[PDB]
Amino acid sequence: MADYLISGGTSYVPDDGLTAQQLFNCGDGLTYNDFLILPGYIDFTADQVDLTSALTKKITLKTPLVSSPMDTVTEAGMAIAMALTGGIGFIHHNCTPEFQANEVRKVKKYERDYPLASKDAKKQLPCGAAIGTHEDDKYRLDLLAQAGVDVVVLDSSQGNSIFQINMIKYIKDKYPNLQVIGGNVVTAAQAKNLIDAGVDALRVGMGSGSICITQEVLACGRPQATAVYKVSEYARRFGVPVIADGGIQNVGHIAKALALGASTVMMGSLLAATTEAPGEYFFSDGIRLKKYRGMGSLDAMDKHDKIKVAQGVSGAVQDKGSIHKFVPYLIAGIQHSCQDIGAKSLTQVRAMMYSGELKFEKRTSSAQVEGGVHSLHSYEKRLF
Template identity: 45%
Template sequence: MNLVVDNTVDVNGNEKNDIGMVVIRGNSVVMIEALEPVNKTHFSQSEQQPYFWAASSTTLVSSSIGSSGTKIYFSWNSGILVHFRAMDGILLEDGFPADRLFNQGYSYTYDDVIFLPHYIDFPTDSVNLRTKLTKNIDLYIPCVSSPMDTVTESSMAVSMAALGGIGIIHYNNLPFEQAALIRSAKSRRIPFISDPIFKSPSDSIDSIDEFASSPCVFVTESGNSKSKLVGVVAKSDWESLTEKEAPVSEYMLGSPFSAPSNYTFDQAAAFLAAKKLDYVPLVSELEGEVVDLFTTADVQRVCGYPKLGVPSLGPDGKFMVGAAVGTREQDKERLEHLVKAGANVVVLDSSQGNSIYQIEMIKYVKRTYPELDVIGGNVVTAYQAQNLIQAGADALRVGMGSGSICTTQEVCAVGRGQATAVYKVSSIAEQSGVPVIADGGIANSGHIVKALVLGASTVMMGSFLAGSNEAPGTYEYQDGHRIKKYRGMGSLEAMTKGSDARYLGDTSKLKVAQGVVGAVADKGSVLKLIPYTMQAVKQGLQDLGAPSVESAHNLLKTRVLRLEVRTGAAQVEGGVHDLVSYKKKSF
């Protein structure tokens, strides 16, 4: 709409002499004062005093000077004001637009930058986190678990899908093993995986330790989950035996009640309550194998967590699960196993994605499996991104050397600060409608907010999820702290197992580590961690005036949202400081 502004009349036709002021540069109106919400904003212009306020996305139509002062005609495009003031001709700005901040030759991390708050006109609960993983896959929360062998296997993939995100199963294993992990995750509809013990009828139970992870032992024809269930041994029954070395066939109970493996959590809980059972095996209706064990303890535990959101389900009604794959010739055979196992999306897992190997692999995947979405990466520059987009990538994974266990920038002298990388790649990918996954550098909910606002549609998390109940590995104790191992896929330990292909290495040559092996603290269950984290993300987006991830992108693109670079002292001030001691508990 065209507005008329002069020194006596505001946009509503009311006489206002001191409400605000306008200044023009060339053919653009660059400064306007806004004292109230947009629909009640008043403007005025003074020829005498150069005290100006600014707005974005306004274009001058014409101006004229008469006896009553200067009249300025301009078009109002964005409808949202950004507040600035110039005093005595010197422009005093509140922050910088992203395109200006990230074009100064500096490589910024998430901690280097801070967003300035905007206008709130909606409650936190109305913030919608639904987003795009790829061109064709939607998620209800912007969370992806990293394809690392200490982060994502079946249990993590199940929990992430149950929460509305997705897990990407690593490929530091044999093709049939990775396919089995995918099948295991997709065969479930409850948000966790138990670890039941199996025996054949002729086996004996040697120790009470065999009941450590389960209240019972299942007896099947072959002694594993992939055969018919014939009986069950309860812990209390075994403890009452006088001859504990006896074969389980002599004292097991007959085949117990079972429930279909595709039962949801609520259905399985209702089944237990109706039958007045303490546990029930979940059995595949097709193969008849025991998929999982569901207990009343599970019901009590999960009911203590925040309510589950909308799960990520594929067209087949099963949990969506992703899988990583390499770019070598033999990975084409692996890819076939993954597709047959039901993988919903594949991630081409490479530390430097702009290679002929990945470009050819993207083309192969799109040619051979046109319905399968493929995520390319990793990239950190617009040039890298453009090559993979042109090859046909459905999404891009952004990050190089930013992970807590990654030493690529130190060892190879290449990479980029993650905030800069996400902004630069997102800017070019957005033009082609290709979503971006911010991979690496996520240590807290604030980093997630920054990644999303800077252009990412989702964030991929490694160390943030490592150490959780659902992460692979067993807990250990170190200096009184409960920990789990967490290693980079570029560490020598992981590369020896096979991940060197990710770094374009040759197994016959010397291996150079681009990662380390470490440990992370126990984080509990992701079924609790992620919901609380997402609530914090919602509050962050609310402070920025963005009711959705898409709106956050638009506010940044239209230069409404502003950023500043934080000094070292500002970063210290922004954290906990000046205390003798404290205990940090996020939820």
């Protein structure tokens, strides 16, 4: 009976790799490409992995994927597609309040099989919308609330402000049933103020986005993986989920963001130039392209005698096809990643991470080269 009595089953496991706490205690400003998750023990098949995810304190999704509130990413079409694949879309506010409300209404009234489709308590697709922290945003909010919006995100580069805190309080007084997402934040100190003010989730990231130049221009921000880990670890103490926002370039980045403590992942460029994204396709040197621009680029700010300091750029992204084809690929990828690290659900991934059972490893520059494609004359990379 010694085989059981020494340690209560709870067998010996050789200690290899670093816990997340150790990896991010080193003070290096790590981001996603700087580390790997070590593989675990596999006892099940990839199709059994559950991706149920908390968007806010009270809104639950079938998948962890959400589309960013950007005028080249999310309108009613994108919101409908993401809700049907089991996520959610946030409708941008670079438009008039009535226009934005009409987009919300199209999503709320919408209606080749969608077992994961997100619904509210009335069998309607959920829809989010963005607002600012200026005075006219109160009227915009009233119209959105009337359209039946399910959650609003307070859209700012630096959410730890008197303006955002006042707006949060105004909302939680006038609309007690509305869920509010605050941000963007990258530190626990910012997160504390926003959680004290009553947000139901946090949007995490500053300057990591593909179109962002805030770190270069204003010298302020944080490496994204560290930002996600630190804010998630703080917000977990109060039961507040975090949306990891910016710098997602592939399925591995999604999996890493979730393993570091995020509950949902927001995507910009990775959903741009899909069919459901707004704007028209164009051609340049034989490649199909669609515009994709920062909300702080001059063109986006000139969308309605003083210096305007641009914080984003305006570019183009290559065609990706349909959301209905692309999102299943991401889902299958995340499921395979969970299987490799030995977890039956995203909830269990994060539980293993906080308990120290999940292990990580740094990657030097040579290790990143080794990790990519190398030593070939030519190749084709087809993902699915």
